[PDB]
Amino acid sequence: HWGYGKHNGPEHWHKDFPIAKGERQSPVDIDTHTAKYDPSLKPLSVSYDQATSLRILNNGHAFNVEFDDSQDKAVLKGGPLDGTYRLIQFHFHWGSLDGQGSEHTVDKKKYAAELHLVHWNTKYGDFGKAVQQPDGLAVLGIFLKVGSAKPGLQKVVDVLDSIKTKGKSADFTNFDPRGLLPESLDYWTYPGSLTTPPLLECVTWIVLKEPISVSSEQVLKFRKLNFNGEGEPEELMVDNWRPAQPLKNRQIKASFK
Ligand SMILES: CCOc1ccc(S(N)(=O)=O)cc1
Ligand SMILES: CCOc1ccc(S(N)(=O)=O)cc1
Ligand SMILES: [Zn+2]
Numbered sequence: 228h229w230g231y232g233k234h235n236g237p238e239h240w241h242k243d244f245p246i247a248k249g250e251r252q253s254p255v256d257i258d259t260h261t262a263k264y265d266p267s268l269k270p271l272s273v274s275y276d277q278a279t280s281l282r283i284l285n286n287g288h289a290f291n292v293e294f295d296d297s298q299d300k301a302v303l304k305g306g307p308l309d310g311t312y313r314l315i316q317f318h319f320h321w322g323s324l325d326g327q328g329s330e331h332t333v334d335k336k337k338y339a340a341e342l343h344l345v346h347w348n349t350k351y352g353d354f355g356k357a358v359q360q361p362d363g364l365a366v367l368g369i370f371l372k373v374g375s376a377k378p379g380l381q382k383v384v385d386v387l388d389s390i391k392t393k394g395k396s397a398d399f400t401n402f403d404p405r406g407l408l409p410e411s412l413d414y415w416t417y418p419g420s421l422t423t424p425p426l427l428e429c430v431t432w433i434v435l436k437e438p439i440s441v442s443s444e445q446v447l448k449f450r451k452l453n454f455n456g457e458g459e460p461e462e463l464m465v466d467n468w469r470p471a472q473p474l475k476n477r478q479i480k481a482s483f484k
Pocket of ligand 3: 318319320343422
């Protein structure tokens with residue numbers, strides 16, 4: 228099974244998922260000087276007021292906070308997107324050290340972690356069908372740096388004790404993801420992929436320029452999670468990030484001058 232260890236990590240994935248060496252893989256380094264301002268890009272529309280969280284799950288690669296996506300309750304639209312994308316889950320990638328952890332980089336800078344809010348295009352009916360389409364998903368990526376605490380993150384941090392190991396889930400209702408957003412919605416955007424297997428090339432990436440701050444204590448609690456299942460040898464869930472992939476024939480666009 229794929230993972231993030233020495234023997235099953237990102238350099239191994241291509242053997243079972245040949246699209247790993249494809250033409251629009253993610254993440255990438257965002258070269259801020261080469262990204263071009265696109266005045267035709269619209270403001271992002273993030274409508275999370277009726278979001279319904281249900282559950283939080285340790286899936287052995289990260290933890291997902293899952294949402295009820297059976298109605299238009301929490302949607303992303305505008306920006307580079309045509310149509311409406313429904314929030315299905317968010318998760319993070321993070322490091323063993325504050326100096327690494329993000330998947331995207333900015334002028335080669337690595338952040339301590341990266342939040343992915345995952346949305347699927349409602350014109351494809353559900354997530355499973357959407358990932359088979361080039362415009363199936365929109366993932367909103369938000370960088371985390373270590374400094375002041377993020378109050379809106381704390382309810383997530385405090386439930387992690389109950390989902391320490393792979394396969395554990397817990398009820399997680401009434402969580403408001405608006406508490407995880409930075410002030411500015413300025414963004415970079417490019418066509419890419421899932422950053423884990425199956426690495427499908429189905430994502431419009433929207434990466435916010437402004438990081439959020441989280442406390443050292445908050446990210447420390449991320450690092451207490453386990454990749455393993457209960458009763459298996461303990462392997463800390465850290466460094467669950469894929470490194471930057473070749474940009475190839477793509478242009479990253481900026482929403483801002
Ligand atoms: C269990 C055999 O070890 C493996 C299994 C899968 C992979 S993958 N999916 O990264 O190519 C690597 C080593
Ligand atoms: C079935 C896998 O679903 C995924 C996998 C990866 C991502 S990410 N890390 O690109 O945002 C989202 C959904
Ligand atoms: Zn992700």
